[PDB]
């Protein structure tokens, strides 16, 4: 019953295209239809970034079924560069949309400069340069080591002299990529809506329930997408088969899902975009 390899590669296959199609389609709608507003710069770059993470799904899926890395060293370095680099770029761009919507509600005249295209673009260049550090590290530090019979591709670290630098960089990544991004976005939303309730007709009560609705989804997405993998791959660094390596690859896909689900959330739920895309594809 090789169903388990079949189900998982399906998930990698379903998730691959929805992210690839959407992010490609979302980008090509933006670049042609709406050349820009600040939100447009964010969705495009998030799409462009979290498009390139879904590019890394074949290579990661190959190793699952094949249980080895047939693509060599140089192709392991760039894939390790691409996947790390545009995980951070997508999480950071996804987080930077988070403070952008917060700044408008709570510091409204400070939004007058934050919401300018140049401000977004300035913030939206720095954010790639920040991720670039991770991209540069993954190139040099990325390589291929023989497991025993099985070649493996990962971030190559010296294992001599009680060196736990792998657990450190997995600690380092987990807090840079998950915790302080979650806390930023979980704060900026939970604080933005407090000003909303503070405003003191039923336009508040209806809209509060509506934005609370919308807010919970993204954090529900981001939590369930990355919490199970980040928990899993840390435990694999302190300690601990066939079924476990499948549960782990299921959790990898869940992280991949956030990059495929994002265009639906951050474009198809934005009317300033959803209105435009509709025409191109509903003429």
């Amino acid at each position: 019953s090789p169903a388990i390899p079949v189900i998982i590669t399906a998930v990698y296959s379903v998730v691959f295209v929805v992210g690839l199609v959407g992010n490609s389609l979302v980008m090509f709608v933006i670049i042609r239809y709406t050349k820009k507003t600040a939100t447009n710069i964010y969705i495009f770059n998030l799409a462009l970034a979290d498009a390139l993470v879904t590019t890394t799904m074949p290579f990661q899926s190959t190793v699952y079924l094949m249980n080895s890395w047939p693509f060599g060293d140089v192709l392991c370095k760039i894939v390790l560069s691409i996947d790390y680099y545009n995980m951070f770029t997508s999480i950071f761009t996804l987080t930077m949309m988070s403070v952008d919507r917060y700044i408008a509600v709570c510091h409204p005249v400070k939004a007058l400069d934050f919401r300018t295209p140049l401000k977004a673009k300035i913030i939206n260049i720095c954010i790639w340069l920040l991720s670039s550090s991770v991209g540069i590290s993954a190139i040099v530090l990325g390589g291929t080591k023989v497991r025993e019979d099985v070649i493996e591709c990962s971030l190559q670290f010296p294992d001599d002299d009680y060196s736990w630098w792998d657990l450190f960089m997995k600690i380092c990544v987990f807090i840079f990529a998950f915790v302080i991004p979650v806390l930023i976005i979980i704060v900026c939303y939970t604080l933005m809506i407090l000003r909303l309730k503070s405003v003191r007709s039923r336009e508040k009560d209806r809209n509060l329930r509506r934005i609370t609705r919308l807010v919970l989804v993204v954090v529900a997405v981001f939590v369930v997408c990355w919490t199970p993998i980040h928990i899993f791959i840390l435990v694999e660094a302190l300690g601990s088969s066939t079924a476990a390596l499948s549960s782990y690859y299921f959790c990898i896909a869940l992280g991949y899902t956030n990059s495929c689900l994002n265009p639906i959330l951050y474009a198809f739920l934005d009317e300033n975009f959803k209105r435009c895309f509709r025409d191109f594809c509903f003429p």
Epitope: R101, V105, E203, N207, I211, D270, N272
Partner: nanobody
Framework: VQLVESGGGLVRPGGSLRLSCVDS??????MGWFRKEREFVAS????????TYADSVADRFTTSRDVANNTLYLQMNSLKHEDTAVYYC??????????WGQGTQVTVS
């Protein structure tokens, strides 16, 4: 009832000025701005997250709404003679903009 359009006034070319229509009587929420025929500059949502920019010159203006103070702003930057016109905030029904402010004319030359 009555909307007090602040800001306005003359300015030099390439300059800036922030306009701020407000309804402190909290009767109407100014959610959009309006500027030949009537011109329609950008508007914003009630809670002030997402603005619908104005295509004409979206490289020059930004808007924001203080939800708590029931105030809508807009500060034009590096505008030209094309932007010179009368400007009036447009309010909304409490629960097809229903209330329209008297308006102020920015005059640049």
């Amino acid at each position: 009832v009555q909307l007090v359009e602040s800001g306005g006034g003359l300015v030099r070319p390439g300059g800036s000025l922030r306009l701020s229509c407000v309804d402190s009587e909290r009767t109407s929420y100014p959610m959009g701005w309006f500027r030949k025929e009537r011109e329609f500059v950008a508007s914003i949502t009630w809670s002030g997250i997402d603005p619908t920019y104005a295509d004409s010159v979206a490289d020059r203006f930004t808007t924001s709404r203080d939800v708590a103070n029931n105030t809508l702003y807009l500060q034009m930057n590096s505008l030209k003679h094309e932007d010179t016109a009368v400007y009036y905030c447009a309010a909304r029904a409490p629960v097809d903009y229903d209330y329209w402010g008297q308006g102020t004319q920015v005059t640049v030359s």
